[PDB]
C-alpha cells in the first residue's frame with residue numbers, strides 16, 4: 001500500500017529544484033573550505049533501506065532484535081575508523097553514532113565535564129567553532145556556553161594561536177576541558193604544547209580535527225592522537241564522507257571514558273542511530289585508508305600552497321601570510337571592502353566562498369576577510385597550474401567589488417543594486433561556468 | 443580525482459551485509475511500532491547531491507551564498523508541513539532542521555525553559571520517551587533530566603494517563619512545560635484537559651506526536667494543534683518519511699516563539715542542516731497530504747483494531763484492553779514469561795517486536811510485556827484478515843516460550859540455550875518467511 005513511482009514522476013516540483021541544484025554545483029568554483037563532493041557509492045549507502053531499522057543502543061547490547069547485520073555494519077565502521085586514524089583498538093575507541101559535528105562536540109563535552117562544567121575553546125571570531133563555547137555579551141549563543149561555563153581564548157595580531165595567553169587563561173580559569181582544532185585556522189596545531197598546558201591545570205585535551213581530518217589520518221600534519229584524550233571529527237569535509245561525526249576517546253589515558261562517551265551519545269542525547277549514515281561512513285573510511293586517498297589529500301595541500309602563492313604574487317594578503325593545510329583566509333583591508341561584499345560578488349560569478357573574521361576585527365559584524373579552501377576543487381581534478389586561474393578570478397572579483405563600491409557606495413544594501421546585470425560579472429560568470437562546467441564531477 | 447565505481451565494486455564487503463539486511467527486512471513480520479518502509483522516491487532524496495551543501499542559517503538569512511535552490515527546498519518543506527498538519531502559516535510556524543526526534547525535543551524544550559528550567563513528562567516505564575525528562579535514582583539518564591529539572595508522572599494501574607495525578611503534580615511542582623504524547627501509549631490523548639492544567643499553572647503545553655503523527659494529520663485522532671504551544675514529531679515512523687524531525691510552534695499564542703525555537707535549533711544546538719533529509723521530508727509530506735495516504739492511515743488503524751481483537755479472542759491480555767491507534771501493548775503476566783524472553787523467541791522466528799513495560803512493573807528491568815504496531819505491515823499490504831495470522835503466529839510464540847522456559851528455566855541465559863535448533867521455531871520461522879517474503883516491498 002505505497003507509491004513506488006520514481007522521484008521525477010512522484011514529485012516533479014522537487015525533482016526540478018534538485019536538478020537545478022546539481023547543475024549549480026557543476027558550474028561553480030566551490031571554494032567553501034568545509035565542502036566536498038561525495039561519490040556515488042557513498043550516496044548509494046545514504047539512500048539504502050538500512051535507514052528503516054531502529055537500533056537504539058550499541059552492537060551486541062541492542063534494545064531490539066534483528067540487529068545482526070546492523071551490528072556488523074556498526075562494527076565494521078568503528079574498526080575501519082580506528083585503522084584510518086592509525087590507532088590501536090586496545091588503546092582507542094570510537095563512537096560512530098553522532099548525527100553531525102555539533103552533536104558530537106556537545107555530547108563529548110558533556111561526557112567529560114557535565115552540566116555547569118568548565119571549558120575553554122578558541123573564540124569564533126579567531127577561528128573557533130560555535131560548539132567550542134561561543135557566546136557574546138548580548139547572549140549565550142551556543143549551548144556550549146550555556147550548559148557549560150566557557151572561557152574563550154584569542155589568536156594574536158598575526159592570526160596564530162597564542163599559547164602564552166592560553167596558559168595564562170587556563171591557570172586562573174581552571175577548566176576541565178581545553179578545546180583545540182578549529183573552523184578557520186590556516187596553520188597546523190602544536191598539540192604537545194596543548195597537552196603540556198592541560199597536564200599543568202589537570203584539564204582534558206579535546207582536539208576537533210573536522211577541517212584537517214584527512215591530513216591527520218594520512219600523516220601529512222601533526223597527530224593529535226599522540227597527545228589528546230578526545231578527538232572529534234565530522235566525516236563530510238576534507239574526509240569526503242557523508243554528513244556525520246566520529247568521537248574518538250583514549251582508553252589508556254582515561255579508564256572509564258568509554259562508558260561516559262557512549263552513554264552521552266545514547267541515551268543522554270540521541271535516540272535511534274541513522275544506519276544509512278553509518279554504512280556511508282563505513283564506505284568512505286575504506287577509501288580514506290588507501291594510498292590513492294593519501295595522494296588526493298597531498299593534492300589538496302599542493303593546490304592550497306599554490307593558491308596561496310598566486311594570491312600573494314597578485315599582492316593579496318593572507319592571514320599568517322600562508323597556509324599549512326587546505327584553507328586560506330584572505331585579509332581584505334588594503335582594498336577597503338568587507339568580506340560580505342566580496343561574498344556577494346563571488347556568488348554573482350558562481351564562485352562559492354564565505355566571509356570570515358580576521359584578527360583585527362573586534363566583532364563578528366563586518367568581517368574583513370574571506371575564507372577559501374581547496375578540497376572540493378581538488379576532488380574535481382584541479383591541479384597546481386589551475387590555481388593561477390582561481391587566483392586570477394578572485395583578483396578580478398576584488399577589483400570589480402572595489403569598482404562597484406566606488407559607484408554605488410559602502411552600504412551593503414546600495415552595493416548589491418550595482419550587481420545585477422553587470423556586464424563584467426556576466427562575462428566573469430561565463431568564464432567560471434565554462435571552466436567549472438567541464439571538470440570531473442562525482 | 444575520485445572513485446566512481448558502484449558500491450558493489452568499491453566495497454564488496456559492505457554491499458553483501460546491506461544485501462543481507464534488505465533480505466532480512468523482506469522476510470520479517472515487522473511489528474516494531476516505530477518502524478516503517480520508505481519508498482524509492484524518499485530514498486532518492488536521501489542519496490541526492492544536495493547533501494554536499496553547507497547552508498547554516500534559515501531561508502533568506504543564510505550565512506553563505508549559493509543557497510537559492512536550498513532555500514526553495516526548505517521553504518517547500520515548511521509550507522508542505524503546515525499544510526499536512528492543517529494549520530495556517532499565519533498562526534503556526536515549523537522548523538525543519540532537527541536531525542532526529544530526540545534532537546527536536548531537547549532543542550524545543552531548551553527554547554521554552556532554558557538550562558535549569560522545569561519540565562514534566564510521562565515516565566519512561568509508563569510509556570514516555572527518554573527525552574521527556576527520564577531519569578532514575580542512580581542517574582540522570584536523559585540530558586532532559588540533567589540540563590532541565592524534571593518531574594515524572596505515571597499512568598494508573600489500568601494503563602491510562604491519570605490527569606488527577608498530573609494536576610496534583612503540576613500544582614506542587616510548577617513547571618514551565620508539560621509534555622504529552624508518548625512512545626508506547628495505546629490510547630488517544632485528551633489535549634484539552636492537558637491545556638486546562640497548563641493554563642492553571644502557567645505552563646507551556648508540549649505535544650510529542652511522533653507515534654501518531656499520521657492520525658493527527660489525517661483527522662482520525664484528537665488534534666493537539668487546537669490546544670498546544672509546541673508540537674514535535676519525527677518524520678520516520680507512521681508518517682513514513684526519512685529519519686528527521688519537525689518542530690511546530692504556535693505564534694498566535696506565543697509572540698516571539700519563532701525566534702526562540704529557531705535559535706535553539708541553530709546556532710544553539712546544530713550546525714549545517716542536512717539538505718538530503720529536508721528534501722526527503724518535502725517529498726513525503728506531499729504524499730502525506732493526499733487522500734490515498736489517508737486511506738493507508740485508516741488501514742493502519744483497521745489492522746490494529748483487528749489485531750487487538752484477534753489477540754483478545756485467543757485469551758491474550760492487552761494493556762487498557764485495546765487500542766485507539768497503531769499500537770498494542772501485550773501484558774504477558776498470565777503466561778509467566780517476560781517480554782525479553784518473547785522478544786528472543788520472536789527474533790528466532792523473524793518476528794520483530796520489542797519488550798515493553800506494563801503498569802504493574804515497578805522497574806525497566808524485566809518488563810512484563812511487548813509492544814507491537816501495524817504501520818510497517820500495513821505498508822507491506824496486510825489487511826484486516828491478515829491480522830489473524832499475525833495473532834496466530836504470536837500466540838504460538840508465546841506457547842513455545844512457555845515450553846522452553848519449562849525445559850531450560852527462567853534465567854534468560856539458560857532460556858536462550860533452548861532456542862538454537864528448535865524444530866518448532868524453524869517450522870514457525872519458515873511459515874513467517876514464506877508469508878512475509880511474498881508481501882509488497884518498497
Ligand SMILES: Cc1[nH]nc2c1[C@](c1cc(F)cc(N3CCC(C(=O)O)CC3)c1)(C(C)C)C(C#N)=C(N)O2
Pocket residue numbers: 123124125126127128129130136141183184354355356357364367498505709
Ligand atoms: C557560520 C559558521 N559556523 N561556525 C563558524 C562560522 C564562521 C562565521 C562567519 C561569520 F561571518 C559569522 C558567523 N557567526 C555565526 C552566528 C553568530 C551568532 O548567531 O551570533 C554570529 C557570527 C560565523 C564561518 C566559518 C562561516 C566562522 C567565522 N568567522 C567561524 N569561526 O566558525
Ligand SMILES: Cc1[nH]nc2c1[C@](c1cc(F)cc(N3CCC(C(=O)O)CC3)c1)(C(C)C)C(C#N)=C(N)O2
Pocket residue numbers: 056063267565566567568569570571572578583625626796797798799806809
Ligand atoms: C528504547 C526506548 N527508547 N524510548 C523508549 C524505549 C522503550 C524502552 C524499553 C525497554 F525495555 C527499556 C528501555 N530503557 C532505555 C534505556 C534506559 C537506561 O539506559 O537507563 C533503560 C530502560 C526503554 C521501548 C519503546 C523500546 C520504552 C519502553 N518501555 C519507552 N517508553 O520509550
Ligand SMILES: Cc1ncc(COP(=O)(O)O)c(CNCC(=O)O)c1O
Pocket residue numbers: 033034100101102103105129131181182183184208209210211234244496712713714715
Ligand atoms: C571545527 C568544526 N567542528 C564542528 C563543525 C560542525 O559540523 P556540523 O555542521 O556537521 O554540525 C564544524 C563546521 N563548520 C562549518 C564550516 O567550517 O564551514 C567545524 O568547522
Ligand SMILES: Cc1ncc(COP(=O)(O)O)c(CNCC(=O)O)c1O
Pocket residue numbers: 054270271272475476542543544545547571573623624625626650651652653676686
Ligand atoms: C515520542 C517519541 N519522541 C521522540 C523519539 C525520538 O526519535 P529519534 O529516535 O529519531 O531520536 C521517539 C522514538 N522512540 C523509539 C520507539 O518508539 O521505538 C518517540 O517514541
Ligand SMILES: [Cl-]
Pocket residue numbers: 046274276277488716718719
Ligand atoms: Cl541522511
